[PDB]
CSV table of C-alpha atoms in Angstrom, one decimal:
chain,number,residue,atom,x,y,z
C,3,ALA,CA,9.1,-18.4,18.9
C,4,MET,CA,6.0,-16.7,17.5
C,5,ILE,CA,3.6,-19.7,17.9
C,6,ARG,CA,3.1,-21.6,21.2
C,7,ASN,CA,-0.3,-23.2,20.3
C,8,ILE,CA,-1.6,-24.8,17.2
C,9,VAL,CA,-5.3,-25.5,16.5
C,10,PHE,CA,-6.5,-27.8,13.7
C,11,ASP,CA,-9.8,-28.5,12.1
C,12,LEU,CA,-10.6,-32.2,11.4
C,13,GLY,CA,-12.6,-32.3,8.2
C,14,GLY,CA,-10.7,-30.7,5.3
C,15,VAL,CA,-7.4,-30.3,7.2
C,16,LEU,CA,-6.7,-33.8,8.6
C,17,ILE,CA,-9.4,-35.9,6.8
C,18,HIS,CA,-9.8,-35.2,3.1
C,19,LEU,CA,-13.5,-34.9,2.3
C,20,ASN,CA,-15.8,-36.1,-0.5
C,21,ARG,CA,-19.3,-34.6,-0.2
C,22,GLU,CA,-20.5,-36.1,-3.5
C,23,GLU,CA,-20.1,-39.6,-2.1
C,24,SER,CA,-22.0,-38.8,1.0
C,25,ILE,CA,-24.7,-37.2,-1.2
C,26,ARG,CA,-24.8,-40.5,-3.2
C,27,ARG,CA,-25.3,-42.6,0.0
C,28,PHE,CA,-28.0,-40.3,1.4
C,29,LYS,CA,-29.9,-40.5,-1.9
C,30,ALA,CA,-29.7,-44.3,-1.7
C,31,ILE,CA,-31.5,-44.3,1.7
C,32,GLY,CA,-34.3,-41.9,0.6
C,33,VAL,CA,-32.9,-38.5,1.7
C,34,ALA,CA,-33.6,-37.0,-1.7
C,35,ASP,CA,-33.3,-33.3,-1.0
C,36,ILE,CA,-30.0,-34.0,0.7
C,37,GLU,CA,-27.9,-31.7,-1.5
C,38,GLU,CA,-29.9,-28.7,-0.4
C,39,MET,CA,-30.0,-30.0,3.2
C,40,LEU,CA,-26.2,-30.1,3.2
C,41,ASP,CA,-25.7,-26.6,1.5
C,42,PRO,CA,-24.4,-23.5,3.5
C,46,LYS,CA,-31.7,-23.2,9.8
C,47,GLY,CA,-31.6,-26.9,9.3
C,48,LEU,CA,-31.5,-30.3,11.1
C,49,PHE,CA,-28.0,-31.0,9.9
C,50,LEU,CA,-27.0,-27.9,11.8
C,51,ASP,CA,-29.0,-29.1,14.8
C,52,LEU,CA,-26.8,-32.2,14.6
C,53,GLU,CA,-23.4,-30.3,14.5
C,54,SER,CA,-24.4,-27.8,17.1
C,55,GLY,CA,-25.7,-30.5,19.5
C,56,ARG,CA,-29.2,-28.8,19.6
C,57,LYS,CA,-30.6,-32.2,18.6
C,58,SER,CA,-29.1,-35.4,19.9
C,59,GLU,CA,-28.2,-38.2,17.4
C,60,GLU,CA,-31.5,-39.9,18.3
C,61,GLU,CA,-33.5,-36.7,17.9
C,62,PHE,CA,-32.0,-35.8,14.5
C,63,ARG,CA,-32.6,-39.3,13.0
C,64,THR,CA,-36.2,-39.3,14.3
C,65,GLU,CA,-36.8,-35.9,12.6
C,66,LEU,CA,-34.9,-37.0,9.4
C,67,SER,CA,-37.1,-40.1,9.2
C,68,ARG,CA,-40.2,-37.9,9.6
C,69,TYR,CA,-38.8,-35.6,6.9
C,70,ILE,CA,-38.4,-38.3,4.2
C,71,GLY,CA,-41.3,-40.5,5.4
C,72,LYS,CA,-39.0,-43.5,6.0
C,73,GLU,CA,-37.4,-44.9,9.1
C,74,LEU,CA,-33.6,-44.7,9.2
C,75,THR,CA,-31.4,-46.5,11.6
C,76,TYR,CA,-28.2,-45.3,13.3
C,77,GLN,CA,-26.2,-47.6,11.0
C,78,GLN,CA,-27.8,-46.2,7.8
C,79,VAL,CA,-27.1,-42.6,8.6
C,80,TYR,CA,-23.7,-43.3,10.1
C,81,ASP,CA,-22.8,-45.2,6.9
C,82,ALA,CA,-24.0,-42.3,4.7
C,83,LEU,CA,-22.2,-39.6,6.7
C,84,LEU,CA,-19.0,-41.6,6.7
C,85,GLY,CA,-19.1,-41.4,2.8
C,86,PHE,CA,-17.7,-37.9,3.4
C,87,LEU,CA,-14.4,-39.3,4.8
C,88,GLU,CA,-12.2,-39.9,1.7
C,89,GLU,CA,-8.8,-40.0,3.4
C,90,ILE,CA,-7.8,-40.0,7.0
C,91,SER,CA,-4.2,-38.6,6.6
C,92,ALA,CA,-1.9,-40.9,8.5
C,93,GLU,CA,1.1,-38.7,7.7
C,94,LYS,CA,-0.5,-35.5,9.0
C,95,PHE,CA,-1.4,-37.3,12.2
C,96,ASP,CA,2.2,-38.5,12.4
C,97,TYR,CA,3.4,-34.9,11.9
C,98,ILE,CA,1.0,-33.6,14.5
C,99,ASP,CA,2.3,-36.3,16.9
C,100,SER,CA,5.9,-34.9,16.4
C,101,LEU,CA,4.6,-31.4,17.4
C,102,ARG,CA,3.4,-32.4,20.8
C,103,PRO,CA,6.5,-31.9,22.9
C,104,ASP,CA,7.1,-28.4,21.5
C,105,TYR,CA,3.5,-27.0,21.2
C,106,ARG,CA,0.2,-27.2,22.8
C,107,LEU,CA,-2.1,-28.8,20.2
C,108,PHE,CA,-5.9,-28.4,19.9
C,109,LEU,CA,-8.7,-29.5,17.6
C,110,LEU,CA,-11.5,-27.1,16.8
C,111,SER,CA,-14.1,-28.9,14.7
C,112,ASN,CA,-17.6,-28.7,13.5
C,113,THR,CA,-18.6,-32.3,13.6
C,114,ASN,CA,-21.3,-34.8,14.5
C,115,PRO,CA,-21.6,-37.7,17.0
C,116,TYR,CA,-21.1,-40.3,14.2
C,117,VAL,CA,-17.7,-39.0,13.1
C,118,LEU,CA,-16.8,-38.7,16.8
C,119,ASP,CA,-17.9,-42.3,17.4
C,120,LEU,CA,-15.4,-43.3,14.6
C,121,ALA,CA,-12.7,-41.0,15.8
C,122,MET,CA,-12.8,-42.3,19.3
C,123,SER,CA,-12.6,-46.0,18.2
C,124,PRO,CA,-9.5,-48.1,17.5
C,125,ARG,CA,-10.5,-48.1,13.8
C,126,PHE,CA,-9.8,-44.5,13.2
C,127,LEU,CA,-6.1,-44.9,12.3
C,128,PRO,CA,-3.9,-47.8,11.3
C,129,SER,CA,-2.0,-47.2,14.6
C,130,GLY,CA,-5.2,-47.7,16.7
C,131,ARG,CA,-4.7,-44.2,18.1
C,132,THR,CA,-7.8,-42.2,19.1
C,133,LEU,CA,-8.3,-38.7,17.9
C,134,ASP,CA,-8.2,-37.4,21.5
C,135,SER,CA,-4.7,-38.8,21.9
C,136,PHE,CA,-3.1,-36.2,19.5
C,137,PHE,CA,-4.4,-33.1,21.2
C,138,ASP,CA,-4.2,-31.5,24.6
C,139,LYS,CA,-7.9,-31.0,24.1
C,140,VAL,CA,-10.6,-31.6,21.5
C,141,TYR,CA,-13.2,-28.9,21.0
C,142,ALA,CA,-16.2,-30.4,19.1
C,143,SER,CA,-19.2,-28.4,18.1
C,144,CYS,CA,-21.8,-31.1,19.1
C,145,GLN,CA,-20.2,-31.5,22.5
C,146,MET,CA,-20.2,-27.8,23.2
C,147,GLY,CA,-23.6,-26.7,21.9
C,148,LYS,CA,-21.8,-24.1,19.7
C,149,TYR,CA,-20.4,-24.0,16.1
C,150,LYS,CA,-18.0,-22.2,13.9
C,151,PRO,CA,-18.0,-19.6,12.6
C,152,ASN,CA,-19.6,-18.0,15.7
C,153,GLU,CA,-17.2,-16.3,18.1
C,154,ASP,CA,-18.7,-18.1,21.1
C,155,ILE,CA,-17.0,-21.4,20.2
C,156,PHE,CA,-13.6,-19.7,19.9
C,157,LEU,CA,-14.1,-17.9,23.2
C,158,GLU,CA,-15.0,-21.1,25.1
C,159,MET,CA,-11.8,-22.6,23.7
C,160,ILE,CA,-9.7,-19.6,24.7
C,161,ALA,CA,-11.2,-19.6,28.3
C,162,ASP,CA,-10.8,-23.4,28.7
C,163,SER,CA,-7.3,-23.8,27.2
C,164,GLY,CA,-5.8,-20.4,28.2
C,165,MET,CA,-4.4,-19.9,24.7
C,166,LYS,CA,-3.4,-16.4,23.7
C,167,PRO,CA,-4.8,-15.8,20.1
C,168,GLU,CA,-1.6,-14.0,19.0
C,169,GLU,CA,0.4,-17.0,20.1
C,170,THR,CA,-1.8,-19.5,18.3
C,171,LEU,CA,-1.8,-20.8,14.7
C,172,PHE,CA,-5.3,-21.8,13.5
C,173,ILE,CA,-5.5,-24.2,10.5
C,174,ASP,CA,-8.9,-24.4,8.9
C,175,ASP,CA,-10.1,-24.8,5.3
C,176,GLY,CA,-13.3,-22.9,6.1
C,177,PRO,CA,-13.0,-19.3,4.9
C,178,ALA,CA,-15.7,-18.1,7.4
C,179,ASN,CA,-13.9,-20.0,10.2
C,180,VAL,CA,-10.6,-18.3,9.2
C,181,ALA,CA,-12.2,-14.9,9.0
C,182,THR,CA,-13.5,-15.3,12.6
C,183,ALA,CA,-10.1,-16.4,13.9
C,184,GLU,CA,-8.5,-13.4,12.2
C,185,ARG,CA,-11.0,-11.1,13.9
C,186,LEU,CA,-10.1,-12.6,17.3
C,187,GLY,CA,-6.4,-12.1,16.7
C,188,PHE,CA,-5.3,-15.7,15.7
C,189,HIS,CA,-2.5,-16.5,13.1
C,190,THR,CA,-4.4,-18.4,10.4
C,191,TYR,CA,-3.6,-20.8,7.6
C,192,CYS,CA,-6.3,-21.9,5.1
C,193,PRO,CA,-5.4,-25.1,3.4
C,194,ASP,CA,-7.4,-26.7,0.6
C,195,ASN,CA,-9.4,-29.9,1.3
C,196,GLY,CA,-6.7,-32.5,0.4
C,197,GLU,CA,-3.6,-30.2,0.3
C,198,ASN,CA,-0.3,-31.5,1.8
C,199,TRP,CA,0.3,-28.6,4.1
C,200,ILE,CA,3.1,-30.1,6.2
C,201,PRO,CA,5.9,-28.2,4.4
C,202,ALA,CA,4.1,-24.9,4.6
C,203,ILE,CA,3.1,-25.3,8.3
C,204,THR,CA,6.7,-26.5,9.2
C,205,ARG,CA,7.8,-23.2,7.7
C,206,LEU,CA,5.3,-21.1,9.7
C,207,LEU,CA,6.5,-22.6,12.9
C,208,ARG,CA,10.1,-21.6,12.1
C,209,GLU,CA,9.3,-17.9,12.5
C,210,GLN,CA,10.4,-15.5,15.3
């Protein structure tokens, strides 16, 4: 076979996202300039990249809006992003494990990770970590897509050959970097059922 390893993003690929809803929740707790804060420097980047801890980001965000925000408040607003956790795509990934090495490469924050590593993430009670040989999370690594450093740490740690790896990410810049490094890529839409198309890619010799 072509492909020995498959790497998935979380947001977009496995969890359908709804940014508007998170924008709504952030506004309701006083983060008024949220829409520009969340647009593609910034403390939301400090949050993904691990540069600020959760505690540090919230302290600064509180200072920024002139209002004290709790863990629970921000957690609740960030989780407005998560419109559907695809049970069927996790089931499909679970079927892939004996035949492939499976990895997650995700820009994400401690809040989503707290959710993902709980028994409330999926109806099955299965943790995110349980579907992959390894999880590569921006905030755990101090690095973030689309920089090459995060891809390179992943390669070194897993031993995956890029030309034997399929990278599934809805982020155009993330895909462009994986192409540059020699990965097979597929760029789904946020909310697309990509199971048939991926099942196809894996068939190839």
